[PDB]
Design a protein around this ligand. Structure first.
Ligand code: GNP
Ligand code: MG
Ligand code: MG
Length: 172
């Protein structure tokens, strides 16, 4: 049953761990417990295929460029998370994407842009700027809330679909 290695990247506090824990354990972690590196394995069926998701939940700011290069080299595709009330988190996406491209020596890497915390009224990142950026990069954009579970399964399942597409492309 095909294995997909998914890496959740983004600035600190955007809800990378909350999103992942909603997917794997079906509840919302209210506390902020900063991550070092966590990994999860999970069995799912997407489009009729049984997938083993190996998900790496990364740190917000890493104490080693080597740890970062390591997860960028391993990952088959990347959930690029920002929080809709954190402009710098959104701005950081470009920088994560650049480093991923450079680490893999490739211009086409499977990725989904995730605007988390869509439940908050405190928005500083507009859905159009995010849609524009994704459109530029040629990747899907999904708005999510780890608190309500809105879009959570959509985000990870879409990333799997992106990986499947990339493999089909790389062979053609
Ligand atoms: N309102 C709301 N809060 C959220 C959402 N997702 C995460 N949070 C909250 O934001 C805080 C940080 O979440 P967390 O998942 O730990 O962020 P992280 O991106 O994993 N942080 P780090 O990079 O340090 O590990 C927590 O208090 C959490 O409850 C969401 O969709 N909505
Ligand atoms: Mg975390
Ligand atoms: Mg980070």
């Amino acid at each position: 049953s095909t294995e997909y290695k998914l890496v959740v990247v983004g600035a600190g506090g955007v809800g990378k761990s909350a999103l992942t824990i909603q997917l794997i354990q079906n509840h919302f972690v209210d506390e902020y417990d900063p991550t070092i590196e966590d990994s999860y394995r999970k069995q799912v069926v997407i489009d009729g295929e049984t997938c083993l998701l190996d998900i790496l939940d990364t740190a917000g700011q890493e104490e080693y460029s080597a740890m970062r290069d390591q997860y960028m080299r391993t990952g088959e595709g990347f959930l690029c998370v920002f929080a809709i009330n954190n402009t710098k988190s959104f701005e950081d996406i470009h920088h994560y994407r650049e480093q991923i491209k450079r680490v893999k020596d490739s211009e086409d890497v499977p990725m989904v842009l995730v605007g988390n915390k869509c439940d908050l009224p405190s928005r500083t990142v507009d859905t159009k700027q995010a849609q524009d950026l994704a459109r530029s990069y040629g990747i899907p954009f999904i708005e999510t809330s780890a608190k309500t579970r809105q879009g959570v399964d959509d985000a990870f399942y879409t990333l799997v679909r992106e990986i499947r597409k990339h493999k089909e492309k790389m062979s053609k």
